[PDB]
Write an enzyme that holds these catalytic residues in place. Structure first.
Site, PDB file in Angstrom:
ATOM      1  N   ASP A  71      46.511  32.875  34.817  1.00 22.33           N
ATOM      2  CA  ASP A  71      47.310  33.645  33.868  1.00 22.33           C
ATOM      3  C   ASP A  71      46.625  33.798  32.516  1.00 22.33           C
ATOM      4  O   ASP A  71      46.914  34.761  31.795  1.00 22.33           O
ATOM      5  CB  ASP A  71      48.684  32.993  33.676  1.00 22.33           C
ATOM      6  CG  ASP A  71      49.534  33.019  34.935  1.00 22.33           C
ATOM      7  OD1 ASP A  71      50.469  33.844  35.004  1.00 22.33           O
ATOM      8  OD2 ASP A  71      49.268  32.217  35.855  1.00 22.33           O
ATOM      9  N   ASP A  75      39.834  35.111  45.046  1.00 23.41           N
ATOM     10  CA  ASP A  75      38.645  35.753  44.486  1.00 23.41           C
ATOM     11  C   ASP A  75      37.472  35.618  45.457  1.00 23.41           C
ATOM     12  O   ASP A  75      36.433  35.040  45.138  1.00 23.41           O
ATOM     13  CB  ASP A  75      38.316  35.153  43.119  1.00 23.41           C
ATOM     14  CG  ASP A  75      37.213  35.910  42.379  1.00 23.41           C
ATOM     15  OD1 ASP A  75      36.711  36.936  42.892  1.00 23.41           O
ATOM     16  OD2 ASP A  75      36.829  35.454  41.280  1.00 23.41           O
ATOM     17  N   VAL A 126      29.016  32.211  32.488  1.00 18.90           N
ATOM     18  CA  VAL A 126      27.614  32.113  32.873  1.00 18.90           C
ATOM     19  C   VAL A 126      27.345  30.767  33.536  1.00 18.90           C
ATOM     20  O   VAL A 126      28.012  29.777  33.242  1.00 18.90           O
ATOM     21  CB  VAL A 126      26.683  32.323  31.659  1.00 18.90           C
ATOM     22  CG1 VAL A 126      27.159  33.505  30.828  1.00 18.90           C
ATOM     23  CG2 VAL A 126      26.601  31.061  30.809  1.00 18.90           C
ATOM     24  N   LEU A 151      20.816  31.620  36.071  1.00 20.74           N
ATOM     25  CA  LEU A 151      21.348  31.894  37.400  1.00 20.74           C
ATOM     26  C   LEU A 151      22.118  33.210  37.448  1.00 20.74           C
ATOM     27  O   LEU A 151      21.977  33.973  38.410  1.00 20.74           O
ATOM     28  CB  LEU A 151      22.245  30.743  37.867  1.00 20.74           C
ATOM     29  CG  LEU A 151      21.552  29.546  38.524  1.00 20.74           C
ATOM     30  CD1 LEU A 151      22.469  28.333  38.541  1.00 20.74           C
ATOM     31  CD2 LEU A 151      21.085  29.888  39.932  1.00 20.74           C
ATOM     32  N   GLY A 152      22.920  33.496  36.433  1.00 21.40           N
ATOM     33  CA  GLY A 152      23.659  34.739  36.391  1.00 21.40           C
ATOM     34  C   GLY A 152      24.885  34.608  35.507  1.00 21.40           C
ATOM     35  O   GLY A 152      25.092  33.594  34.840  1.00 21.40           O
TER      36      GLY A 152
HETATM   37  N1  LIG Z   1      27.732  26.706  42.046  1.00 20.62           N
HETATM   38  C1  LIG Z   1      26.706  27.562  42.070  1.00 20.62           C
HETATM   39  N2  LIG Z   1      25.545  27.167  42.643  1.00 20.62           N
HETATM   40  C2  LIG Z   1      24.516  28.020  42.667  1.00 20.62           C
HETATM   41  N3  LIG Z   1      24.450  29.267  42.190  1.00 20.62           N
HETATM   42  C3  LIG Z   1      25.611  29.629  41.631  1.00 20.62           C
HETATM   43  C4  LIG Z   1      26.760  28.863  41.529  1.00 20.62           C
HETATM   44  N4  LIG Z   1      27.768  29.566  40.886  1.00 20.62           N
HETATM   45  C5  LIG Z   1      27.213  30.725  40.619  1.00 20.62           C
HETATM   46  N5  LIG Z   1      25.914  30.834  41.038  1.00 20.62           N
HETATM   47  C6  LIG Z   1      25.033  31.988  40.888  1.00 20.62           C
HETATM   48  O1  LIG Z   1      25.427  32.697  39.727  1.00 20.62           O
HETATM   49  C7  LIG Z   1      25.679  34.079  40.049  1.00 20.62           C
HETATM   50  C8  LIG Z   1      27.164  34.304  40.114  1.00 20.62           C
HETATM   51  O2  LIG Z   1      27.784  33.741  38.940  1.00 20.62           O
HETATM   52  P1  LIG Z   1      29.316  33.992  38.626  1.00 20.62           P
HETATM   53  O3  LIG Z   1      29.689  33.557  37.205  1.00 20.62           O
HETATM   54  O4  LIG Z   1      30.115  33.253  39.627  1.00 20.62           O
HETATM   55  O5  LIG Z   1      29.523  35.583  38.681  1.00 20.62           O
HETATM   56  P2  LIG Z   1      29.726  36.401  40.002  1.00 20.62           P
HETATM   57  O6  LIG Z   1      29.864  35.469  41.159  1.00 20.62           O
HETATM   58  O7  LIG Z   1      28.498  37.332  40.238  1.00 20.62           O
HETATM   59  N6  LIG Z   1      31.133  37.306  39.873  1.00 20.62           N
HETATM   60  P3  LIG Z   1      32.348  36.326  39.215  1.00 20.62           P
HETATM   61  O8  LIG Z   1      32.243  34.858  39.805  1.00 20.62           O
HETATM   62  O9  LIG Z   1      33.777  36.922  39.512  1.00 20.62           O
HETATM   63  O10 LIG Z   1      32.163  36.275  37.734  1.00 20.62           O
HETATM   64  C9  LIG Z   1      24.939  34.318  41.356  1.00 20.62           C
HETATM   65  O11 LIG Z   1      23.581  34.655  41.099  1.00 20.62           O
HETATM   66  C10 LIG Z   1      25.086  32.970  42.063  1.00 20.62           C
HETATM   67  O12 LIG Z   1      24.011  32.726  42.963  1.00 20.62           O
HETATM   68  C1  LIG Z   2      40.916  31.428  38.460  1.00 20.47           C
HETATM   69  N1  LIG Z   2      40.561  30.038  38.678  1.00 20.47           N
HETATM   70  C2  LIG Z   2      41.387  29.006  38.797  1.00 20.47           C
HETATM   71  N2  LIG Z   2      40.684  27.898  38.987  1.00 20.47           N
HETATM   72  C3  LIG Z   2      39.366  28.230  38.993  1.00 20.47           C
HETATM   73  C4  LIG Z   2      38.175  27.477  39.149  1.00 20.47           C
HETATM   74  F1  LIG Z   2      38.280  26.133  39.339  1.00 20.47           F
HETATM   75  C5  LIG Z   2      36.932  28.114  39.115  1.00 20.47           C
HETATM   76  N3  LIG Z   2      35.680  27.384  39.267  1.00 20.47           N
HETATM   77  C6  LIG Z   2      35.310  26.621  40.460  1.00 20.47           C
HETATM   78  C7  LIG Z   2      36.279  26.172  41.344  1.00 20.47           C
HETATM   79  C8  LIG Z   2      35.935  25.443  42.468  1.00 20.47           C
HETATM   80  C9  LIG Z   2      34.608  25.154  42.726  1.00 20.47           C
HETATM   81 BR1  LIG Z   2      34.152  24.132  44.307  1.00 20.47          BR
HETATM   82  C10 LIG Z   2      33.626  25.598  41.856  1.00 20.47           C
HETATM   83  C11 LIG Z   2      33.974  26.328  40.725  1.00 20.47           C
HETATM   84 CL1  LIG Z   2      32.681  26.885  39.624  1.00 20.47          CL
HETATM   85  C12 LIG Z   2      36.884  29.498  38.909  1.00 20.47           C
HETATM   86  C13 LIG Z   2      35.545  30.225  38.851  1.00 20.47           C
HETATM   87  O1  LIG Z   2      34.545  29.620  39.033  1.00 20.47           O
HETATM   88  N4  LIG Z   2      35.517  31.649  38.553  1.00 20.47           N
HETATM   89  O2  LIG Z   2      34.303  32.352  38.487  1.00 20.47           O
HETATM   90  C14 LIG Z   2      34.232  33.054  37.279  1.00 20.47           C
HETATM   91  C15 LIG Z   2      34.736  34.467  37.558  1.00 20.47           C
HETATM   92  O3  LIG Z   2      35.480  34.907  36.458  1.00 20.47           O
HETATM   93  C16 LIG Z   2      38.044  30.234  38.752  1.00 20.47           C
HETATM   94  C17 LIG Z   2      39.295  29.579  38.798  1.00 20.47           C
END
Ligand SMILES: Nc1ncnc2c1ncn2[C@@H]1O[C@H](COP(=O)(O)OP(=O)(O)NP(=O)(O)O)[C@@H](O)[C@H]1O
Ligand SMILES: Cn1cnc2c(F)c(Nc3ccc(Br)cc3Cl)c(C(=O)NOCCO)cc21
Ligand SMILES: Nc1ncnc2c1ncn2[C@@H]1O[C@H](COP(=O)(O)OP(=O)(O)NP(=O)(O)O)[C@@H](O)[C@H]1O
Lengths: 273, 308
Positions: free
Chosen positions: B175, B148, B39, B35-36
């Protein structure tokens, strides 16, 4: 480097338990009989130019010996595997020391500790060695004596962006403005001036027992550091003493050329309470 | 809370399907594709044949704070609204914190934008409504802020829903991990960069900046050239210094309506006190328009990328 090229006689060194990790390989306790610190690195670059400059730097550290600089003992390179062996520092890192509840810092103890650090940084600079990573975690305090660790180590080219907050606080504005993804740390403008700025942050830690910037986002810290507004604010926000704050304002000077030398900073620390 | 019936019937259906899965570990999943990363992986769950999205983050730190992170993160079981992606569970495994989420058919709006090139104003009105509703829900029900907001964290489905991911629920995870990253882009408000006390006002800015990127297909700062606009290599500090010391982005005056142009202008005011809050934004003319509008979102999404 086969370690037999060093003045420390070597038959056998034994690795011991690892003692924490970092960006720069794995540091193991070890026994030379004396305990030593052994840092295991790997050169992904594997390019002759990286090793030639590595050989240049480790041969320079061979020439160093000072009571406030950690004793560099040997280094052996069986590429890509490298290992750096320094004297093991008993006692606590200055980082964990000031942050102790039980610790008793005072206007004199901080001056004494800081003069020790300046002497060590003075020697390193006299030999033209830029520390490039002076911070509280790389300074050891055992009873009276203070030792500087991990000097010159950033000149190595071994195996998005992730930047710790603790490191950002010690970084001078010249450096954080140049940070960008895809740029390696070896290309950053470390210098003698960038080293005295990091001494500014370690002196602040001696006064405040904490970071000058609270744990923000990296992006937040990058702008505050690089704009010089961040250090402007913390300089005004909480004061300790006019004489104490004078050296902090001098070390954190935004223009690097307006920062004092370490030999000068020894005198400033003397005319104190 | 303006809770629609079809939304409340699809909220119940997934809460009762949430107990059919129960708890999980690491061997219950199986990979599918990439997906990306930033990870997350498309994943097949074997006890319950539902296909889920598992995002993995690698954290080797002292286990005492890993337990404090997981217990702060389990509050996501209480967070449930039609504009927040479905939460399954959180657990530590192999020193890799894994979040099991709803799979969103269309991915992130960052992916959608690259394939779509540009995003029309008609439909950016719908996502804007979803975000303010999702941010009001988060600030009112649990008293947190997002911290974010960016297109890669706005998720869509062929079902026609809009929901946001990756919001800041755990203060310790902020943090300990999230603060240390810095990308090539920044979606952070100008008051956050200068390290003042920021509120959800900072999130408004992120939404505004994100809307401009989706509307024009380009990350807005530095603003495009005059002739580059007609067609449609920088260090990170010069980026951040521009956000703080330069005018904010604005939409081009020739292509988009005042309601849209003024909407982002109120989102992108540098002073958060004068910047629009969520109350003022919910009643803004651009919101009243699109909320009363009639768009078939599922049709645009599936015909843009090729789903069904
Ligand atoms: N819950 C999810 N359901 C479907 N696709 C997701 C989900 N979370 C992330 N993705 C996919 O994964 C990629 C983003 O992953 P992610 O780790 O969140 O990095 P980012 O959003 O590009 N920047 P960041 O979240 O700050 O690291 C995109 O291609 C999204 O479509
Ligand atoms: C800083 N921080 C504090 N809590 C967090 C948390 F629960 C996260 N995940 C999340 C939360 C709610 C739902 Br609905 C779905 C997801 Cl996947 C993420 C996160 O997913 N960052 O993306 C990576 C980017 O570096 C970050 C969090
Ligand atoms: N000469 C030494 N004597 C004793 N302990 C040391 C020595 N050098 C490093 N250490 C310890 O080894 C661990 C890792 O050191 P190091 O790789 O330098 O990271 P750090 O200085 O603690 N912070 P960082 O450099 O950002 O990873 C820490 O617990 C240090 O205190």
């Amino acid at each position: 480097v086969y370690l037999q090229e060093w003045d420390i006689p070597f038959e056998q060194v034994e690795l011991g338990e690892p003692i924490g990790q970092g960006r720069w390989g794995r540091v193991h306790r070890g026994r030379w009989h004396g305990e030593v610190a052994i840092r295991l690195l790997e050169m992904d670059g594997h390019n002759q130019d990286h090793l030639k400059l590595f050989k240049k730097e480790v041969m320079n550290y061979r020439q160093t010996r000072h009571e406030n600089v950690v004793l560099f003992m040997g280094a052996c390179m069986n590429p890509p595997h490298l290992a750096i062996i320094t004297s093991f520092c008993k006692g606590r890192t200055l980082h964990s020391f000031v942050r102790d509840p039980k610790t008793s810092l005072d206007i004199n103890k901080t001056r004494q500790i800081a003069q020790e650090i300046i002497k060590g940084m003075g020697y390193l600079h006299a030999k033209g060695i830029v520390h490039k990573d002076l911070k509280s975690k790389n300074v050891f305090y055992d009873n009276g004596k203070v030792v500087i660790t991990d000097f010159g180590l950033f000149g190595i080219s071994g195996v998005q962006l992730k930047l710790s907050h603790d490191w950002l606080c010690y970084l001078a504005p010249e450096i954080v403005r140049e940070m960008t993804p895809g740029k390696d740390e070896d290309q950053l403008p470390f210098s003698k001036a960038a080293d005295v700025y990091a001494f500014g942050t370690v002196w602040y830690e001696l006064q405040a027992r904490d970071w000058p910037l609270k744990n923000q986002a990296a992006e937040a810290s990058i702008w505050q550091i690089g704009s010089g507004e961040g250090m402007k604010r913390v300089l005004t926000s909480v004061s300790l003493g006019k004489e104490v704050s004078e050296i902090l304002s001098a070390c954190w000077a935004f223009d690097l050329q307006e920062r004092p030398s370490f030999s000068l900073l020894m005198d400033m620390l003397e005319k104190l309470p | 809370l303006e809770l629609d019936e079809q939304q409340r019937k699809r909220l119940e259906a997934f809460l009762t399907q949430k107990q059919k899965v129960g708890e999980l570990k690491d061997d219950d999943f199986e990979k599918i594709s990439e997906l990306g990363a930033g990870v997350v992986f498309k994943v097949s769950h074997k006890p319950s044949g539902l296909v889920m999205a598992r995002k993995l983050i690698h954290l080797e730190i002292k286990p005492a704070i890993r337990n404090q992170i997981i217990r702060e993160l389990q509050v996501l079981h209480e967070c449930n609204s039609p504009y927040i992606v479905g939460f399954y569970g959180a657990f530590y495994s192999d020193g890799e914190i894994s979040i099991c989420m709803e799979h969103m058919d269309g991915g992130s709006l960052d992916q959608v934008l690259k394939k779509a090139g540009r995003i029309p104003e008609q439909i950016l009105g719908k996502v804007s409504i979803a975000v303010i509703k999702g941010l009001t829900y988060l600030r009112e029900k649990h008293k947190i802020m997002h911290r974010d907001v960016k297109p890669s964290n706005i998720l869509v489905n062929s079902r026609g829903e809009i929901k946001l991911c990756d919001f800041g629920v755990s203060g310790q995870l902020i943090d300990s991990m999230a603060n240390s990253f810095v990308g090539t882009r920044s979606y952070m408000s100008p008051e956050r960069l200068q390290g003042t006390h920021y509120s959800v006002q900072s999130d408004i800015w992120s939404m505004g900046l994100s809307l401009v990127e989706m509307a024009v297909g380009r990350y807005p700062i530095p603003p495009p050239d005059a002739k580059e606009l007609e067609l449609m290599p920088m260090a990170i500090f010069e980026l951040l210094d521009y956000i703080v010391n330069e005018p904010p982005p604005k939409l081009p005056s020739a292509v988009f309506s005042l309601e849209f142009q003024d909407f982002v202008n109120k989102c992108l005011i540098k002073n958060p006190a004068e910047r629009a809050d969520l109350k003022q934004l919910m009643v803004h003319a651009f919101i009243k328009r699109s909320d009363a509008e009639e768009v078939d979102f599922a049709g645009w999404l599936c015909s843009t990328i090729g789903l069904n």
